[PDB]
Write an enzyme that holds these catalytic residues in place. Structure first.
Site, PDB file in Angstrom:
ATOM      1  CE1 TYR A 118      -3.874   2.548   0.719  1.00  0.00           C
ATOM      2  CE2 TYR A 118      -2.184   3.423   2.188  1.00  0.00           C
ATOM      3  CZ  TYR A 118      -3.405   3.549   1.521  1.00  0.00           C
ATOM      4  OH  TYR A 118      -4.105   4.699   1.653  1.00  0.00           O
ATOM      5  CD  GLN A 119       1.916   2.762   4.079  1.00  0.00           C
ATOM      6  OE1 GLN A 119       1.338   3.819   4.243  1.00  0.00           O
ATOM      7  NE2 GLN A 119       1.332   1.600   4.284  1.00  0.00           N
ATOM      8  CG  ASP A 174     -10.416  18.774   8.305  1.00  0.00           C
ATOM      9  OD1 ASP A 174     -10.265  17.690   7.688  1.00  0.00           O
ATOM     10  OD2 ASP A 174     -11.334  19.589   7.989  1.00  0.00           O
ATOM     11  CG  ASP A 184      -2.306   6.499   4.202  1.00  0.00           C
ATOM     12  OD1 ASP A 184      -3.293   5.731   4.381  1.00  0.00           O
ATOM     13  OD2 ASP A 184      -1.211   6.337   4.820  1.00  0.00           O
ATOM     14  CB  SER A 185      -8.287   8.822   4.447  1.00  0.00           C
ATOM     15  OG  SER A 185      -8.801   7.842   3.527  1.00  0.00           O
TER      16      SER A 185
HETATM   17  C1  MTA Z   1      -2.537   5.664   9.894  1.00  0.00           C
HETATM   18  S1  MTA Z   1      -2.883   6.369   8.310  1.00  0.00           S
HETATM   19  C2  MTA Z   1      -4.437   7.245   8.200  1.00  0.00           C
HETATM   20  C3  MTA Z   1      -4.397   8.569   8.961  1.00  0.00           C
HETATM   21  O1  MTA Z   1      -5.288   9.620   8.513  1.00  0.00           O
HETATM   22  C4  MTA Z   1      -5.480  10.487   9.640  1.00  0.00           C
HETATM   23  N1  MTA Z   1      -6.615  11.401   9.379  1.00  0.00           N
HETATM   24  C5  MTA Z   1      -7.902  11.041   9.465  1.00  0.00           C
HETATM   25  N2  MTA Z   1      -8.706  12.078   9.160  1.00  0.00           N
HETATM   26  C6  MTA Z   1      -7.948  13.133   8.823  1.00  0.00           C
HETATM   27  C7  MTA Z   1      -8.212  14.524   8.382  1.00  0.00           C
HETATM   28  N3  MTA Z   1      -9.484  15.009   8.236  1.00  0.00           N
HETATM   29  N4  MTA Z   1      -7.115  15.294   8.168  1.00  0.00           N
HETATM   30  C8  MTA Z   1      -5.841  14.846   8.306  1.00  0.00           C
HETATM   31  N5  MTA Z   1      -5.541  13.582   8.690  1.00  0.00           N
HETATM   32  C9  MTA Z   1      -6.547  12.688   8.966  1.00  0.00           C
HETATM   33  C10 MTA Z   1      -5.747   9.477  10.741  1.00  0.00           C
HETATM   34  O2  MTA Z   1      -5.572  10.050  12.035  1.00  0.00           O
HETATM   35  C11 MTA Z   1      -4.690   8.410  10.434  1.00  0.00           C
HETATM   36  O3  MTA Z   1      -3.441   8.703  11.078  1.00  0.00           O
END
Ligand code: MTA
Ligand code: MTA
EC number: 2.5.1.16
Lengths: 286, 286
Positions: free
Chosen positions: A65-66, A141, A159-160
């Site tokens: 994935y990475q 965010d 990567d959410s």
């Molecule tokens: C572990 S990889 C996925 C990451 O996305 C992060 N993440 C989730 N939602 C958001 C957002 N709205 N903005 C930035 N990062 C996010 C989560 O905390 C997690 O670390």
């Protein structure tokens, strides 16, 4: 949570099916401001990070994935120097992006600082990205962060975590227009893009949406035992109408692949990742 | 075992990991001469066939496996007329094979006629193979049956149950020499070939073994959510030293794929199926 030595993952987004991983030891289990964070040492998959009950990653297979989410867009851009990662608190995407000598600056916008600390402790092989001098670490965010940027980035990667947590904000289809605005004139993006065995209908809808924002939209996938149905896809969009995502503009040499310590990605794998099972090819093309 | 509405698959061949499927209805559960047979209606995967506790197939996803195992060797043969299927109790591979106008007969040798009877009832989209005029159905251990044949087949497909129970005889490496003898001079074979994410060491051993028997040997793989780790591979062997397994000697047009009602296989998928993640490419080539 963990019952009888097994952790079982279930989710409404993949009803009637479940992966369990056997647990050697519980390592960490606390709620941050944003989500439930659970880490365990699994018997056969090394350490396993869980956010709100959904597996984010395992040390054994996280490399597919990475590498693909980083290298699909990076090797589809002739000279990417400025990169944005949204999310990626485990450090793994960052780990892969900084490997490219053309990359000078990687801004990472991660909402949850607790994820970052736990990945540092429990995912050392992923969190090694945090020691790069290319990193600008940002907090917040990513949706609202995207608004801050115009004509700024060669590549954006998202990567959410899951649409039920903080990552919901990133599911407003308007995020793609924000990403387009944030990109340079010839910029490219790669987003996590749905499993074709699970939500083919959403991929088709997302493709059509992306198609009316960008001259070049493509869908690719990779296999990863510990994602639901054992694989996941990527949405790729270019503001450059000459981008041919299926043929990498930067093909990696074997020496490059070796030097980068890549375990999944190479040039041929880049090409094949766009070749879909007939059912999906039909749905997205016909 | 079904417990609390779920069927959970474990096997020492994939330690520390489990697929569970949600059960709507138990349908059949009886031991034949040879093995334990379990059929249930799952919530989201259609009917599910389980032999000695290991999933054989689900109605929802069986097509990827069925189509690839049949079309990978058949499309790599210039004119396959005489086909041998070992196992295939469910009729699925048979179904896919008889679609080819070149095929005149398919002998299928299945050890356990109770699997045939349960599949005809519970897997009617697979058991439609048994309708074919091209079938010569045979009973017995495909191993000892293989000895009866010399210079007889264009293609041999082995679609077996697992190396516990009655499919043990087929896991003797000698079986590959028996298949070579059973094949015409330019014959080809396809056997289920191990998941590259689970037993890459075994693929390497198996490929070296086959390479000392056959001038051309290849490994390809397909994705299938309900196989361990979400995918399975295929050993391909040809007695024809000019065989190029990765480029189909018989390409299918879109019209043909449409006519054949294919859901997974097509010619681009054929070629892509030989493109392995870097770790497996390294292991098998370098
Ligand atoms: C572990 S990889 C996925 C990451 O996305 C992060 N993440 C989730 N939602 C958001 C957002 N709205 N903005 C930035 N990062 C996010 C989560 O905390 C997690 O670390
Ligand atoms: C359901 S498809 C797999 C099939 O292979 C069949 N099979 C297992 N072992 C053997 C054997 N030694 N010879 C022929 N068929 C077999 C099983 O009974 C099952 O129908």
């Amino acid at each position: 949570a963990i019952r009888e030595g097994w952790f079982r993952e279930t989710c409404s987004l993949w009803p009637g099916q479940a992966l369990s991983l056997q647990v050697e030891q519980l390592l960490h289990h606390r709620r941050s401001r944003y989500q439930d964070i659970l880490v365990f040492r699994s018997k056969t998959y090394g350490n396993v990070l869980v956010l709100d009950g959904v597996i984010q990653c395992t040390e054994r297979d996280e490399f597919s994935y990475q590498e693909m989410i980083a290298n699909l867009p990076l090797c589809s851009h002739p000279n990417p120097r400025k990169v944005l990662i949204i999310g990626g608190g485990d450090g793994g995407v960052l780990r892969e992006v900084v490997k490219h000598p053309s990359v000078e600056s990687v801004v990472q916008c991660e909402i949850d600082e607790d994820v970052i600390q736990v990945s540092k402790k429990f995912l050392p092989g992923m969190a090694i990205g945090y020691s790069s001098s290319k990193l600008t670490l940002h907090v917040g965010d990513g949706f609202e962060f995207m608004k801050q940027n115009q004509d700024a980035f060669d590549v954006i990667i998202t990567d959410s975590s899951d649409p039920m947590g903080p990552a919901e904000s990133l599911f407003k289809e308007s995020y793609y227009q924000l990403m387009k605005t944030a990109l340079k004139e010839d910029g490219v993006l790669c987003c996590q893009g749905e499993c074709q065995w699970l939500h083919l209908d959403l991929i088709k809808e997302m493709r059509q949406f992306c198609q009316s924002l960008f001259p070049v939209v493509a869908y690719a996938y990779c296999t990863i035992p510990t994602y639901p149905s054992g694989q996941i896809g990527f949405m790729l969009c270019s503001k450059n109408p000459s981008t041919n995502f299926q043929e990498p503009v930067q093909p990696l040499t074997q020496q490059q692949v070796a030097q980068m310590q890549l375990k999944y990605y190479n040039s041929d794998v880049h090409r094949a990742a766009f070749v879909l099972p007939e059912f999906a090819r039909k749905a997205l093309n016909d």
